[PDB]
Design a protein around this ligand. Structure first.
Ligand SMILES: CC(C)(C)NC(=O)c1c[nH]c2ncc(-c3ncn4c3CCCC4)nc12
Length: 266
């Protein structure tokens, strides 16, 4: 887990900065090969980076960004695998010709990652299109575990804002569970089928909460299959018990993906 600064070469231009800090590109000399990496650069703040690292250390799934390790040098640094096509929201804004079936394939992969996170009893707590990275046009991985928590053995929720991705019960009761990650996944789907548009455009946090309270929901993106819209809406079920878990969401996605795959072969 602890990497050697002298084996890491960082590009001086950064890939980006914002809420999440700074991300730089570099490469890291492995046992034999050299690996292109993305590096997130950072007192209770030292602890938050370590705590994110502690989470990622515990995860191993094809649809989750892999942590190479951490290094204390100029700054604390979290070194991750590189996703060349970058964040999914920025990619779809730039690539409007991306077909319906491809978008289904990408959000299915996200659901596979999340089903695994749910099984591991971690809550992500920041699931959004901006945190899905594209390794290829056909391979998405979840990242940014900065808010992620391991669930206690006795409860299915963590008790504590990107209000636009949050389920009512996060807003009402500060309660975060795999079910509220499913709410968040609905909005991520809405983002994906809207080619990376931000949700609830032009609305304030308070107005979104008010809209949700009256049972109103975002409408169907232009050209989004009804089956996918119906699934987003199921994700945004008010009642936490009746809202589907990721197993159910992943199965629904998988089966629809096979459907469209079969139609394309015809
Ligand atoms: C914290 C955040 C943003 C979730 N990123 C990561 O966790 C990353 C892990 N591997 C990556 N590879 C590329 C980028 C990338 N490529 C282009 N950009 C980025 C991230 C910064 C904006 C532009 N971001 C990450």
């Amino acid at each position: 887990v602890y990497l050697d600064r002298k084996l890491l070469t960082l590009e001086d231009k950064e890939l980006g900065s914002g809420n999440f800090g700074t991300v730089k590109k570099g490469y890291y000399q492995m046992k034999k090969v050299v690996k292109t990496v993305a590096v997130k650069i950072l007192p209770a703040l030292k602890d938050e980076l370590l705590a994110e690292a502690n989470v990622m250390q515990q995860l191993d799934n094809p649809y989750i960004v892999r942590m190479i390790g951490i290094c204390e040098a100029e700054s604390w640094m979290l070194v991750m695998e590189m996703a060349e096509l970058g964040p999914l929201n920025k990619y779809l804004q730039q690539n409007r010709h991306v077909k319906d079936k491809n978008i289904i394939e990408l959000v299915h992969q996200v659901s596979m990652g999340m089903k695994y996170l749910e099984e591991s009893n971690f809550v992500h707590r920041d699931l959004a299109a901006r945190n899905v990275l594209l390794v290829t046009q056909h391979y998405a991985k979840i990242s940014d575990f900065g808010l992620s928590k391991a669930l206690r053995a006795d409860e299915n929720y963590y008790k504590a804002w990107p209000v636009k991705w949050y389920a009512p019960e996060c807003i009402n009761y500060y309660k975060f569970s795999s079910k509220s990650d499913v709410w968040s996944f609905g909005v991520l789907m809405w983002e994906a089928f809207s080619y990376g548009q931000k949700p609830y455009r032009g609305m304030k946090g308070s107005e979104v909460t008010a809209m949700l309270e009256k049972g109103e929901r975002m409408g169907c993106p232009a050209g989004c299959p009804r089956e996918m819209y119906d699934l987003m809406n199921l994700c945004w079920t008010y009642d936490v018990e009746n809202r589907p878990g990721f197993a159910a969401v992943e199965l629904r996605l998988r089966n629809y993906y096979y459907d469209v795959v079969n139609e394309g072969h015809h």
